[PDB]
């Protein structure tokens, strides 16, 4: 009986480690001997250690992920796609935890429950990727949504943080209601909630005889809810406001982690929910609109975080290009784009957090950065060019292969929109590089040097971005392996 739980040690470990960290923090924060120590950095380091140990548990136990698959069949399904998605998710969480260490000291964020809630959200997303049922997917989505609602309003005294948390909670609850109504309408029309059953019942009757109103409506509502979750327009109701008002270490996590898991869910819904290519049209329109709106909205931004939010929306549209073209080479392009975008976003948010110790708010603030810190300016310019998609950098490979996938299915209209949006994006990305190097402001802002964690993260990510084209084979190999394993 104990060996049936060999498939859930990575989750059991992280759950128990979160419990131990919570007990440790609550016991020793409210202590008289140690004069109420602000043990946020301690809990952060121990949580990073826990993440690394559960990464070791999950990665090493690769043959054991299919163990007791019949017993766990109704609960979750673990396969090669889940394995790599979960490993990438743990890596991103560890990177975010590493970045947010300096936030706890200079700004004096002494609340240790931030790390505990991050770990609980990580557990929710681990259960999300392997979820093979509507019920499990909904529960994991709600768990991570609550863990994010709580930490979005962590800055209680801040006007922006409270409003951002309120807007985030309202939007997320509305999206969850729409998704949940879609799930109810699907369950009431087919009588099944498991993905295997829901694939066997829908794969044959491909609207050949008539269009099932209930099934079509449920599919549409689930798609709409998921589109709210990833903030693809016109379902970006308050996403820029949430990104701006949220704390920067918090904004770093929501910009990366909630996207990997939700995209995994959308893929595991496409494996069965391809009902008459209905989602392919919805994602087609959503991707075009997302690229256009992100490109046309990030040029009218003077703040760094709003520009990052609109960049995230544009890259979500670029990724949804892969959804619109349903093929192995489309899903592979989608996953490569997700990986590259996550790494670039981690790079950019580490750079922003490095300058956040001096309260950077506007693009003009980073005006004379090429004179005071002439290597941080180079790193930020590299990240901006990678966002733009300049050929020599790693950001070009994702857009290249996504455009190739789009042209494979024969959608020539998507390619033209992507090209125009790429031109606009490159313009407003090199606009930032103009400020750092070419302008000569009268007043300069001097920043204090960053710490070791963010310096190492920036160095590694910048070496990845510039030198990815030389050795891109492993990423393509693992991505092609994941895309094929979605069905066999």
């Amino acid at each position: 009986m104990f060996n049936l739980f060999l498939a859930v040690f990575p989750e059991i470990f992280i759950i128990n480690a979160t419990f131990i960290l919570l007990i440790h923090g609550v016991v020793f924060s409210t202590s008289k001997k140690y004069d109420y120590p602000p043990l946020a950095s301690n809990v952060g380091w121990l949580g990073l250690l826990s993440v690394l140990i559960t990464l070791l548990l999950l990665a090493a136990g690769a043959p054991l992920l299919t163990i007791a698959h019949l017993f766990w069949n109704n609960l979750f399904r673990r396969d090669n796609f889940t394995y790599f998605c979960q490993i990438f998710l743990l890596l991103s969480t560890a990177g975010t935890i590493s970045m947010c260490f300096d936030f706890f000291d200079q700004e004096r964020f002494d609340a240790f429950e931030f790390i505990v809630l991050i770990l609980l959200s990580t557990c929710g997303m681990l259960f999300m990727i392997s979820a093979y049922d509507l019920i499990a997917m909904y529960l994991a989505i709600e768990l991570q949504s609550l863990c994010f609602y709580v930490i979005a309003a962590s800055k209680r005294k801040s006007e922006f943080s409270t409003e951002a948390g309120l807007k985030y909670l309202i939007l997320g609850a509305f999206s969850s209601g729409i998704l949940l109504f879609g799930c109810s309408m699907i369950y009431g029309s087919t009588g099944a909630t498991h993905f295997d059953q829901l694939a066997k019942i829908l794969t044959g009757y491909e609207i050949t005889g008539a269009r099932s109103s209930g099934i079509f409506m449920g599919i549409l509502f689930i798609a709409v809810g998921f589109l709210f979750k990833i903030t693809a327009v016109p379902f970006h109701m308050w996403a820029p406001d949430i990104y701006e008002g949220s704390p920067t270490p918090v904004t770093a996590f929501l910009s990366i982690a909630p996207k990997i898991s939700i995209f995994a869910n959308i893929l595991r819904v496409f494996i069965y929910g391809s009902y008459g290519a209905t989602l392919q049209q919805i994602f087609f329109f959503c991707s075009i609109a997302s690229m256009i709106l992100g490109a046309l909205a990030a040029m009218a931004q003077t703040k760094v975080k709003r520009l990052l939010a609109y960049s995230s929306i544009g890259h979500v549209g670029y990724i949804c290009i892969g959804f619109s073209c349903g093929t192995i080479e489309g899903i592979q392009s989608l996953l490569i784009g997700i990986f590259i975008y996550a790494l670039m976003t981690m790079d950019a948010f580490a750079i922003v957090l490095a300058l956040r110790q001096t309260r950077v708010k506007y693009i003009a603030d980073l005006g004379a950065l090429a004179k005071t810190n002439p290597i941080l300016a180079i790193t930020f310019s590299i990240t901006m060019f990678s966002y733009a998609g300049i050929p020599p950098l790693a950001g070009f490979c994702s857009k290249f292969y996504l455009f190739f996938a789009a042209l494979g299915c024969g959608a020539y209209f998507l390619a033209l929109v992507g090209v125009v949006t790429s031109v606009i994006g490159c313009f407003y990305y090199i606009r930032l590089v103009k400020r750092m190097f070419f302008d000569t402001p009268r007043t300069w802002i001097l920043y204090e040097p960053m710490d070791r964690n963010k310096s190492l993260l920036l160095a590694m990510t910048s070496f990845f971005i510039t030198l990815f084209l030389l050795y891109p084979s492993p990423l393509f190999s693992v991505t092609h392996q994941m895309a094929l394993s979605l069905y066999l």
């Binding site: 800055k155 801040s158 006007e159 922006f160 943080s161 701006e244 008002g245 704390p247 920067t248 003077t302 975080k305 309260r359 708010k361 506007y362 693009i363 003009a364 603030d365 005006g367 402001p441 009268r442 007043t443 802002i445």
Partner: protein, 122 residues
């Protein structure tokens, strides 16, 4: 004689929101926001840069009706920045931008009313 700092000292009357009138000192050739920063009426950490694009009307001031004719007219950028941050999308018709008002020796005794503070941390 010689070049004195007092030769470019602009005397101003700044009223903080609770109706107290205190006399601030500025330099002719620098922005009125800089003059307000010297005493501490406006937090220097909120408007560290005297630039239009690095501004969200954190330097908004209320110039007197008779003291507004001796100033350059508001530019398009100034109006655009003023409207968005008004929280009501309305124009006060007597509110200027601190970073866009350059002090001059003809502005001796200009009465300026500083509105209430607004959040700027993030």
């Amino acid at each position: 004689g010689s070049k004195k700092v007092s030769d470019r000292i602009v005397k101003l009357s700044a009223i903080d929101p609770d109706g107290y009138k205190q006399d601030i000192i500025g330099l002719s050739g620098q922005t009125l926001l800089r003059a307000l920063t010297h005493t501490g009426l406006i937090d220097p950490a909120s408007h560290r840069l005297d630039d239009i694009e690095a501004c969200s009307a954190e330097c908004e001031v209320q110039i007197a009706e008779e003291w507004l004719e001796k100033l350059p007219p508001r530019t398009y950028d100034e109006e655009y920045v003023l409207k968005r941050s008004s929280r009501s999308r309305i124009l006060n018709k007597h509110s200027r931008l601190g970073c866009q008002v350059v002090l001059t020796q003809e502005l001796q005794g200009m009465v300026v009313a500083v509105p209430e503070a607004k959040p700027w941390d993030i």
